[PDB]
mmCIF file of C-alpha atoms in Angstrom:
data_model
loop_
_atom_site.group_PDB
_atom_site.id
_atom_site.type_symbol
_atom_site.label_atom_id
_atom_site.label_comp_id
_atom_site.label_asym_id
_atom_site.label_seq_id
_atom_site.Cartn_x
_atom_site.Cartn_y
_atom_site.Cartn_z
ATOM 1 C CA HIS A 50 -59.099 61.728 128.366
ATOM 2 C CA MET A 51 -61.583 63.634 129.976
ATOM 3 C CA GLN A 52 -60.083 63.063 133.120
ATOM 4 C CA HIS A 53 -62.455 65.472 135.069
ATOM 5 C CA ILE A 54 -65.732 63.080 134.316
ATOM 6 C CA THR A 55 -66.315 59.755 135.296
ATOM 7 C CA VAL A 56 -66.406 56.853 132.926
ATOM 8 C CA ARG A 57 -70.439 55.770 133.312
ATOM 9 C CA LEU A 58 -70.681 52.292 134.348
ATOM 10 C CA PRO A 59 -72.107 50.025 131.467
ATOM 11 C CA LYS A 60 -75.892 49.586 131.662
ATOM 12 C CA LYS A 61 -75.265 45.451 131.257
ATOM 13 C CA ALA A 62 -73.060 45.850 134.055
ATOM 14 C CA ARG A 63 -75.399 48.023 136.228
ATOM 15 C CA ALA A 64 -78.415 45.825 135.708
ATOM 16 C CA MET A 65 -76.242 42.778 137.269
ATOM 17 C CA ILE A 66 -75.129 44.840 140.386
ATOM 18 C CA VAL A 67 -78.475 46.282 141.348
ATOM 19 C CA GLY A 68 -80.088 42.729 140.930
ATOM 20 C CA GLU A 69 -79.945 40.157 143.836
ATOM 21 C CA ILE A 70 -76.548 38.893 144.357
ATOM 22 C CA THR A 71 -78.453 35.449 144.404
ATOM 23 C CA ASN A 72 -79.520 35.536 140.717
ATOM 24 C CA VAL A 73 -75.537 35.854 140.244
ATOM 25 C CA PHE A 74 -74.390 32.693 141.616
ATOM 26 C CA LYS A 75 -77.677 30.483 141.505
ATOM 27 C CA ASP A 76 -76.663 28.661 138.576
ATOM 28 C CA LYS A 77 -73.288 29.905 138.217
ATOM 29 C CA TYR A 78 -71.549 28.374 141.297
ATOM 30 C CA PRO A 79 -72.763 25.075 141.130
ATOM 31 C CA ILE A 80 -72.043 25.266 137.444
ATOM 32 C CA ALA A 81 -68.348 26.192 137.901
ATOM 33 C CA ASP A 82 -67.904 23.891 140.970
ATOM 34 C CA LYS A 83 -69.045 20.960 138.632
ATOM 35 C CA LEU A 84 -66.788 21.827 135.770
ATOM 36 C CA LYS A 85 -63.804 21.470 137.980
ATOM 37 C CA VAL A 86 -63.876 17.629 136.943
ATOM 38 C CA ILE A 87 -65.941 16.210 134.228
ATOM 39 C CA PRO A 88 -65.055 13.146 131.947
ATOM 40 C CA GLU A 89 -64.721 15.231 128.998
ATOM 41 C CA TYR A 90 -61.309 16.439 130.010
ATOM 42 C CA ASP A 91 -60.055 12.726 130.138
ATOM 43 C CA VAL A 92 -61.062 12.149 126.724
ATOM 44 C CA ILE A 93 -59.081 15.393 125.575
ATOM 45 C CA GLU A 94 -55.999 14.564 127.301
ATOM 46 C CA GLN A 95 -56.320 11.285 126.245
ATOM 47 C CA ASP A 96 -56.616 12.670 122.430
ATOM 48 C CA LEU A 97 -54.067 14.794 122.911
ATOM 49 C CA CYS A 98 -51.802 12.006 123.751
ATOM 50 C CA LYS A 99 -52.616 9.919 120.804
ATOM 51 C CA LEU A 100 -52.541 12.774 118.127
ATOM 52 C CA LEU A 101 -48.921 14.191 119.254
ATOM 53 C CA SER A 102 -47.047 11.237 120.611
ATOM 54 C CA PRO A 103 -46.324 9.950 116.781
ATOM 55 C CA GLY A 104 -44.739 13.358 116.161
ATOM 56 C CA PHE A 105 -42.233 13.224 118.802
ATOM 57 C CA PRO A 106 -41.443 9.777 119.023
ATOM 58 C CA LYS A 107 -39.213 8.252 122.284
ATOM 59 C CA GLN A 108 -39.628 11.513 124.127
ATOM 60 C CA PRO A 109 -42.196 11.520 127.116
ATOM 61 C CA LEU A 110 -45.441 13.497 126.513
ATOM 62 C CA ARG A 111 -47.577 14.364 129.644
ATOM 63 C CA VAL A 112 -50.721 16.726 129.524
ATOM 64 C CA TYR A 113 -51.537 19.535 132.278
ATOM 65 C CA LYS A 114 -54.955 21.018 132.590
ATOM 66 C CA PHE A 115 -55.274 24.327 134.177
ATOM 67 C CA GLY A 116 -57.039 27.723 133.636
ATOM 68 C CA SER A 117 -60.571 28.994 135.031
ATOM 69 C CA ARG A 118 -62.648 25.480 134.340
ATOM 70 C CA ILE A 119 -59.783 23.448 136.543
ATOM 71 C CA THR A 120 -60.000 26.480 139.614
ATOM 72 C CA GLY A 121 -63.552 26.453 139.775
ATOM 73 C CA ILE A 122 -64.506 29.580 137.955
ATOM 74 C CA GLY A 123 -65.940 28.593 134.734
ATOM 75 C CA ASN A 124 -68.826 27.947 132.502
ATOM 76 C CA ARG A 125 -69.979 25.830 129.798
ATOM 77 C CA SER A 126 -68.289 28.209 127.319
ATOM 78 C CA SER A 127 -65.179 28.802 128.886
ATOM 79 C CA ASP A 128 -61.797 27.226 127.016
ATOM 80 C CA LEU A 129 -59.682 24.592 128.651
ATOM 81 C CA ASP A 130 -55.909 25.520 128.649
ATOM 82 C CA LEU A 131 -53.658 22.528 128.524
ATOM 83 C CA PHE A 132 -49.766 22.273 128.607
ATOM 84 C CA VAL A 133 -48.079 19.891 126.901
ATOM 85 C CA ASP A 134 -45.019 18.865 128.139
ATOM 86 C CA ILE A 135 -42.848 17.188 125.681
ATOM 87 C CA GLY A 136 -39.410 15.909 127.115
ATOM 88 C CA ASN A 137 -39.448 16.901 130.613
ATOM 89 C CA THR A 138 -39.521 20.864 130.113
ATOM 90 C CA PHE A 139 -41.953 21.365 133.043
ATOM 91 C CA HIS A 140 -39.231 23.020 135.098
ATOM 92 C CA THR A 141 -37.762 25.270 132.177
ATOM 93 C CA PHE A 142 -38.741 28.952 132.382
ATOM 94 C CA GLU A 143 -38.616 31.031 129.147
ATOM 95 C CA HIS A 144 -40.013 34.478 129.715
ATOM 96 C CA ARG A 145 -39.909 34.812 125.659
ATOM 97 C CA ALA A 146 -40.503 31.353 123.860
ATOM 98 C CA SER A 147 -37.297 29.817 122.661
ATOM 99 C CA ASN A 148 -36.424 29.543 119.036
ATOM 100 C CA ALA A 149 -36.914 25.539 120.037
ATOM 101 C CA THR A 150 -39.815 25.921 121.887
ATOM 102 C CA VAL A 151 -41.382 28.063 118.558
ATOM 103 C CA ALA A 152 -40.201 24.925 116.440
ATOM 104 C CA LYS A 153 -42.222 22.845 118.453
ATOM 105 C CA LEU A 154 -45.273 24.763 118.771
ATOM 106 C CA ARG A 155 -44.704 25.102 115.002
ATOM 107 C CA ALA A 156 -44.425 21.377 114.172
ATOM 108 C CA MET A 157 -47.707 20.713 116.605
ATOM 109 C CA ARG A 158 -49.609 22.743 114.409
ATOM 110 C CA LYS A 159 -49.968 20.563 111.619
ATOM 111 C CA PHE A 160 -51.157 17.666 113.795
ATOM 112 C CA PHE A 161 -54.114 19.511 114.979
ATOM 113 C CA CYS A 162 -54.624 20.975 111.306
ATOM 114 C CA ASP A 163 -54.511 17.012 109.878
ATOM 115 C CA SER A 164 -56.595 15.558 112.152
ATOM 116 C CA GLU A 165 -60.289 15.423 111.627
ATOM 117 C CA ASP A 166 -61.003 15.530 115.564
ATOM 118 C CA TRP A 167 -59.328 19.064 115.865
ATOM 119 C CA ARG A 168 -60.729 22.348 114.366
ATOM 120 C CA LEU A 169 -57.294 24.981 114.206
ATOM 121 C CA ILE A 170 -58.708 28.140 115.308
ATOM 122 C CA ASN A 171 -55.459 29.954 115.639
ATOM 123 C CA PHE A 172 -51.794 29.510 115.872
ATOM 124 C CA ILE A 173 -50.487 32.689 117.812
ATOM 125 C CA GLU A 174 -46.483 32.424 117.859
ATOM 126 C CA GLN A 175 -45.709 35.969 118.862
ATOM 127 C CA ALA A 176 -47.295 36.257 122.328
ATOM 128 C CA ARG A 177 -45.352 35.863 125.436
ATOM 129 C CA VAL A 178 -46.541 32.796 125.342
ATOM 130 C CA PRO A 179 -47.326 31.315 122.142
ATOM 131 C CA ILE A 180 -50.521 28.925 122.183
ATOM 132 C CA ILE A 181 -52.324 27.188 119.681
ATOM 133 C CA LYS A 182 -55.949 27.738 119.749
ATOM 134 C CA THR A 183 -58.137 24.480 118.671
ATOM 135 C CA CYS A 184 -61.648 23.265 119.159
ATOM 136 C CA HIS A 185 -61.922 19.397 120.407
ATOM 137 C CA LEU A 186 -64.720 18.526 118.003
ATOM 138 C CA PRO A 187 -65.779 15.448 120.130
ATOM 139 C CA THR A 188 -66.688 17.565 123.296
ATOM 140 C CA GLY A 189 -66.953 20.694 121.415
ATOM 141 C CA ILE A 190 -64.418 22.306 123.983
ATOM 142 C CA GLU A 191 -62.348 24.818 122.719
ATOM 143 C CA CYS A 192 -58.527 24.401 124.163
ATOM 144 C CA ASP A 193 -55.539 26.609 124.094
ATOM 145 C CA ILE A 194 -52.225 24.558 124.061
ATOM 146 C CA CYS A 195 -49.111 25.858 125.644
ATOM 147 C CA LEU A 196 -45.731 24.602 126.063
ATOM 148 C CA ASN A 197 -44.863 25.989 129.740
ATOM 149 C CA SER A 198 -45.595 25.068 133.364
ATOM 150 C CA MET A 199 -46.682 28.426 134.592
ATOM 151 C CA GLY A 200 -50.123 28.447 134.331
ATOM 152 C CA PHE A 201 -50.355 25.060 135.788
ATOM 153 C CA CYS A 202 -48.677 26.019 138.700
ATOM 154 C CA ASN A 203 -50.486 28.947 139.361
ATOM 155 C CA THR A 204 -53.948 26.723 139.000
ATOM 156 C CA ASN A 205 -52.988 24.824 141.520
ATOM 157 C CA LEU A 206 -52.268 27.696 143.913
ATOM 158 C CA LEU A 207 -55.641 29.175 143.141
ATOM 159 C CA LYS A 208 -57.404 25.807 143.694
ATOM 160 C CA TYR A 209 -55.892 25.359 146.926
ATOM 161 C CA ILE A 210 -57.123 29.026 147.762
ATOM 162 C CA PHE A 211 -60.280 28.610 146.684
ATOM 163 C CA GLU A 212 -60.738 25.548 148.331
ATOM 164 C CA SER A 213 -59.578 26.752 151.678
ATOM 165 C CA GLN A 214 -61.532 29.729 151.511
ATOM 166 C CA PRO A 215 -64.404 29.391 149.219
ATOM 167 C CA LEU A 216 -65.538 33.339 149.814
ATOM 168 C CA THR A 217 -62.466 33.680 147.309
ATOM 169 C CA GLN A 218 -64.141 31.524 144.534
ATOM 170 C CA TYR A 219 -67.604 33.324 144.712
ATOM 171 C CA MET A 220 -65.909 36.640 144.544
ATOM 172 C CA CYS A 221 -63.881 35.502 141.302
ATOM 173 C CA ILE A 222 -67.037 34.094 139.594
ATOM 174 C CA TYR A 223 -68.794 37.508 140.470
ATOM 175 C CA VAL A 224 -66.035 39.873 139.327
ATOM 176 C CA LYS A 225 -65.224 37.569 136.324
ATOM 177 C CA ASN A 226 -68.795 38.255 135.296
ATOM 178 C CA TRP A 227 -68.597 41.664 136.238
ATOM 179 C CA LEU A 228 -65.616 42.207 133.635
ATOM 180 C CA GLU A 229 -67.393 40.843 130.876
ATOM 181 C CA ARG A 230 -70.643 43.022 131.439
ATOM 182 C CA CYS A 231 -68.127 46.107 131.532
ATOM 183 C CA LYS A 232 -66.398 45.170 128.363
ATOM 184 C CA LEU A 233 -63.249 45.403 130.335
ATOM 185 C CA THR A 234 -61.659 42.296 129.191
ATOM 186 C CA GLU A 235 -59.330 43.745 126.609
ATOM 187 C CA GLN A 236 -57.345 45.211 129.195
ATOM 188 C CA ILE A 237 -58.063 43.291 132.501
ATOM 189 C CA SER A 238 -58.407 39.756 132.448
ATOM 190 C CA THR A 239 -60.046 37.167 134.931
ATOM 191 C CA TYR A 240 -56.705 35.795 135.985
ATOM 192 C CA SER A 241 -55.379 39.476 136.976
ATOM 193 C CA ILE A 242 -58.785 40.222 138.891
ATOM 194 C CA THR A 243 -58.271 36.893 140.493
ATOM 195 C CA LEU A 244 -55.095 38.104 141.982
ATOM 196 C CA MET A 245 -56.623 41.450 142.998
ATOM 197 C CA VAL A 246 -59.244 39.330 144.968
ATOM 198 C CA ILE A 247 -56.808 37.405 146.429
ATOM 199 C CA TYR A 248 -54.404 40.252 147.431
ATOM 200 C CA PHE A 249 -57.669 41.956 149.206
ATOM 201 C CA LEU A 250 -58.314 38.910 151.342
ATOM 202 C CA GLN A 251 -54.857 38.714 152.357
ATOM 203 C CA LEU A 252 -55.488 42.354 153.675
ATOM 204 C CA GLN A 253 -58.502 41.029 155.567
ATOM 205 C CA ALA A 254 -56.272 38.277 157.261
ATOM 206 C CA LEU A 255 -58.212 35.551 155.204
ATOM 207 C CA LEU A 256 -55.759 34.562 152.946
ATOM 208 C CA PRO A 257 -51.880 34.024 153.416
ATOM 209 C CA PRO A 258 -48.950 36.080 151.725
ATOM 210 C CA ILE A 259 -47.529 33.160 148.894
ATOM 211 C CA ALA A 260 -44.257 34.229 150.376
ATOM 212 C CA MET A 261 -45.168 32.507 154.099
ATOM 213 C CA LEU A 262 -46.342 29.274 151.997
ATOM 214 C CA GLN A 263 -42.692 29.225 150.429
ATOM 215 C CA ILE A 264 -40.636 29.080 153.427
ATOM 216 C CA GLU A 265 -37.350 27.142 152.554
ATOM 217 C CA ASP A 266 -35.828 25.523 155.273
ATOM 218 C CA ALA A 267 -35.324 21.793 156.376
ATOM 219 C CA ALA A 268 -38.550 20.616 156.190
ATOM 220 C CA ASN A 269 -39.601 22.485 152.814
ATOM 221 C CA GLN A 270 -37.348 22.775 149.779
ATOM 222 C CA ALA A 271 -38.553 24.546 146.373
ATOM 223 C CA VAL A 272 -39.997 23.100 143.067
ATOM 224 C CA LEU A 273 -37.898 25.513 140.816
ATOM 225 C CA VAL A 274 -39.006 26.525 137.150
ATOM 226 C CA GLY A 275 -36.081 28.577 136.387
ATOM 227 C CA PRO A 276 -35.996 31.311 139.072
ATOM 228 C CA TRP A 277 -39.404 30.660 140.390
ATOM 229 C CA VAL A 278 -40.564 28.670 143.500
ATOM 230 C CA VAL A 279 -43.661 27.081 141.899
ATOM 231 C CA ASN A 280 -44.771 24.865 145.101
ATOM 232 C CA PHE A 281 -46.088 25.961 148.526
ATOM 233 C CA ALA A 282 -47.111 24.436 151.819
ATOM 234 C CA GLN A 283 -50.527 22.931 151.630
ATOM 235 C CA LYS A 284 -50.970 23.713 155.390
ATOM 236 C CA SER A 285 -54.352 23.895 156.522
ATOM 237 C CA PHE A 286 -55.854 27.118 157.690
ATOM 238 C CA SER A 287 -56.516 25.961 160.974
ATOM 239 C CA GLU A 288 -52.735 25.623 161.314
ATOM 240 C CA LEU A 289 -52.240 28.679 159.419
ATOM 241 C CA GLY A 290 -54.464 30.464 161.762
ATOM 242 C CA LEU A 291 -56.600 31.843 159.358
ATOM 243 C CA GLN A 292 -60.243 31.719 159.777
ATOM 244 C CA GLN A 293 -62.758 30.005 157.244
ATOM 245 C CA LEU A 294 -66.037 31.703 156.417
ATOM 246 C CA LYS A 295 -69.129 30.372 155.060
ATOM 247 C CA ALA A 296 -70.195 32.201 151.883
ATOM 248 C CA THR A 297 -73.333 33.791 152.012
ATOM 249 C CA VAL A 298 -75.014 36.087 150.091
ATOM 250 C CA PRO A 299 -74.722 39.154 152.534
ATOM 251 C CA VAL A 300 -70.920 37.922 153.415
ATOM 252 C CA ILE A 301 -70.197 38.018 149.709
ATOM 253 C CA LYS A 302 -72.337 41.373 149.018
ATOM 254 C CA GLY A 303 -69.988 43.151 152.071
ATOM 255 C CA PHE A 304 -66.826 41.807 150.603
ATOM 256 C CA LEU A 305 -67.502 42.722 147.266
ATOM 257 C CA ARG A 306 -68.727 46.477 148.036
ATOM 258 C CA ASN A 307 -65.150 46.318 150.181
ATOM 259 C CA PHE A 308 -63.374 44.987 147.105
ATOM 260 C CA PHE A 309 -64.616 47.602 144.759
ATOM 261 C CA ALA A 310 -64.043 50.462 147.182
ATOM 262 C CA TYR A 311 -60.981 49.438 147.856
ATOM 263 C CA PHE A 312 -59.395 49.277 144.290
ATOM 264 C CA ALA A 313 -61.766 52.381 143.411
ATOM 265 C CA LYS A 314 -59.019 54.516 145.914
ATOM 266 C CA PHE A 315 -56.072 52.246 145.454
ATOM 267 C CA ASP A 316 -53.037 54.360 144.444
ATOM 268 C CA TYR A 317 -51.703 52.676 141.524
ATOM 269 C CA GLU A 318 -48.828 55.603 141.148
ATOM 270 C CA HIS A 319 -47.170 54.477 143.905
ATOM 271 C CA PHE A 320 -47.974 50.713 145.054
ATOM 272 C CA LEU A 321 -49.120 47.526 143.304
ATOM 273 C CA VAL A 322 -51.116 44.787 143.964
ATOM 274 C CA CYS A 323 -48.732 41.931 145.730
ATOM 275 C CA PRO A 324 -50.143 38.636 146.439
ATOM 276 C CA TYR A 325 -46.417 37.510 147.098
ATOM 277 C CA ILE A 326 -45.893 39.691 149.970
ATOM 278 C CA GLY A 327 -49.839 40.107 150.757
ATOM 279 C CA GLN A 328 -49.447 43.255 153.154
ATOM 280 C CA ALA A 329 -50.728 46.689 152.471
ATOM 281 C CA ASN A 330 -48.784 49.338 150.902
ATOM 282 C CA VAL A 331 -46.429 47.705 149.025
ATOM 283 C CA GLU A 332 -44.185 50.016 147.137
ATOM 284 C CA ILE A 333 -43.610 49.921 143.583
ATOM 285 C CA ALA A 334 -39.923 51.773 144.390
ATOM 286 C CA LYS A 335 -39.347 48.635 146.813
ATOM 287 C CA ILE A 336 -40.634 45.425 145.286
ATOM 288 C CA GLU A 337 -37.704 44.617 143.467
ATOM 289 C CA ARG A 338 -35.619 44.696 146.685
ATOM 290 C CA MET A 339 -38.009 42.460 148.581
ATOM 291 C CA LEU A 340 -37.904 39.343 146.311
ATOM 292 C CA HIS A 341 -36.154 36.148 146.995
ATOM 293 C CA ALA A 342 -32.413 36.145 145.713
ATOM 294 C CA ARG A 343 -33.322 34.086 142.682
ATOM 295 C CA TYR A 344 -35.204 37.390 141.361
ATOM 296 C CA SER A 345 -32.041 39.689 141.302
ATOM 297 C CA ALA A 346 -29.873 36.999 139.957
ATOM 298 C CA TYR A 347 -32.453 36.134 137.225
ATOM 299 C CA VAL A 348 -32.656 39.664 136.211
ATOM 300 C CA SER A 349 -28.992 40.072 136.229
ATOM 301 C CA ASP A 350 -28.762 37.389 133.142
ATOM 302 C CA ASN A 351 -31.812 38.554 131.576
ATOM 303 C CA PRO A 352 -31.921 42.787 132.311
ATOM 304 C CA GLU A 353 -34.669 43.098 129.902
ATOM 305 C CA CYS A 354 -37.122 40.676 131.936
ATOM 306 C CA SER A 355 -37.250 42.511 135.127
ATOM 307 C CA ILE A 356 -41.075 43.542 136.092
ATOM 308 C CA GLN A 357 -42.433 46.046 134.059
ATOM 309 C CA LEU A 358 -43.203 48.724 136.613
ATOM 310 C CA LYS A 359 -43.525 52.176 134.609
ATOM 311 C CA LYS A 360 -47.160 51.078 133.823
ATOM 312 C CA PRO A 361 -50.145 52.742 135.215
ATOM 313 C CA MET A 362 -51.336 49.781 136.809
ATOM 314 C CA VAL A 363 -49.143 46.914 138.531
ATOM 315 C CA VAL A 364 -50.280 43.373 139.762
ATOM 316 C CA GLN A 365 -47.584 41.060 140.487
ATOM 317 C CA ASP A 366 -47.874 37.507 139.698
ATOM 318 C CA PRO A 367 -47.368 35.630 142.961
ATOM 319 C CA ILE A 368 -45.019 32.815 141.517
ATOM 320 C CA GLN A 369 -43.764 34.485 138.265
ATOM 321 C CA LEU A 370 -42.549 37.411 139.885
ATOM 322 C CA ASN A 371 -41.067 39.402 136.957
ATOM 323 C CA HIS A 372 -44.557 39.555 135.447
ATOM 324 C CA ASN A 373 -47.179 42.436 135.981
ATOM 325 C CA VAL A 374 -49.891 40.798 134.628
ATOM 326 C CA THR A 375 -51.797 44.432 133.927
ATOM 327 C CA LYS A 376 -48.674 45.847 132.161
ATOM 328 C CA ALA A 377 -51.108 46.474 128.991
ATOM 329 C CA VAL A 378 -53.704 48.476 130.993
ATOM 330 C CA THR A 379 -53.467 52.004 129.503
ATOM 331 C CA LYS A 380 -53.913 55.260 131.501
ATOM 332 C CA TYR A 381 -57.816 55.770 130.195
ATOM 333 C CA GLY A 382 -58.102 51.885 131.127
ATOM 334 C CA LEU A 383 -57.284 52.302 134.782
ATOM 335 C CA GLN A 384 -59.308 55.341 134.576
ATOM 336 C CA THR A 385 -62.348 53.398 133.768
ATOM 337 C CA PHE A 386 -61.785 50.358 135.778
ATOM 338 C CA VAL A 387 -61.626 52.809 138.809
ATOM 339 C CA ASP A 388 -64.693 54.550 137.775
ATOM 340 C CA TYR A 389 -66.306 51.292 137.367
ATOM 341 C CA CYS A 390 -65.089 50.174 140.844
ATOM 342 C CA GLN A 391 -66.342 53.491 142.273
ATOM 343 C CA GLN A 392 -69.761 53.229 140.710
ATOM 344 C CA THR A 393 -69.823 49.513 141.566
ATOM 345 C CA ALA A 394 -69.111 50.008 145.004
ATOM 346 C CA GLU A 395 -71.554 52.640 145.296
ATOM 347 C CA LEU A 396 -74.556 50.597 144.155
ATOM 348 C CA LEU A 397 -73.619 47.632 146.628
ATOM 349 C CA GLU A 398 -74.401 50.002 149.663
ATOM 350 C CA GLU A 399 -77.149 49.445 151.852
ATOM 351 C CA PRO A 400 -77.314 52.301 154.555
#
């Protein structure tokens, strides 16, 4: 659509970008760090167990917290994501929820509804990942409750990445806020652009390929959720041979300029963002042959569950390798993102 005219960067974004990088982080980073762990979360998880256990007597029940609060890029308005594991379902993968999973979520709904400690906000059973959205009234924190473990698994990977290489965390706080000010979150999520930051830094030799953390040998076995390897070697970057930078304003600004310039000129027709492989120029035409043998076997028995590559923008989840997290980005949404990237890189320059 008017592909010959650049989509103008929104003024709400422009003001943030041309304003000092300091003001971006002065409050936001300390807040995000603090929100990795606060006692409110223990209250939420204790209340969730007490609420739901009677509904599932004799089954084990464990609560796993995840999402932006837990990884260190949240703010006070952020939700908290919770995987409720009833009956040791952690290692079970369902690309689309099973009838059994849906029946469980439907049963859980009335508990939040009847309970005075919880306000039911929405019940979403048609999504790829069905969720219950509910406010925990004693803390006021909005919670997304799901029934599979993949988000928790990628949260733990992000936490390792952010703690090892804090530049990654600063960059993700910045680009999260940039997406919001650009009004792009309908199309590109915080998690998607987090994977884009990770991939970009892998290309700079500042983060390992995820595949390199998941070598399967005598010393290292996989934790499998269905066909997906969800654990990783928690090696020091010293051992990996990767330098660990101190995030300063000038360091952050230079890496952000290069991030936006890179994705402004990325060839989305032929290549995908691929933190699994962590190397430059990963071809859409080749990725499905570059994955572990479990992927090929999984698609054989689930032929409609292969990664969706016939899409404008391909960003592959590094653990759930059949998931293009940007599969809903349209041609015009991608043009908009590219144009906003181009204009942001321009405003971060300083000859």
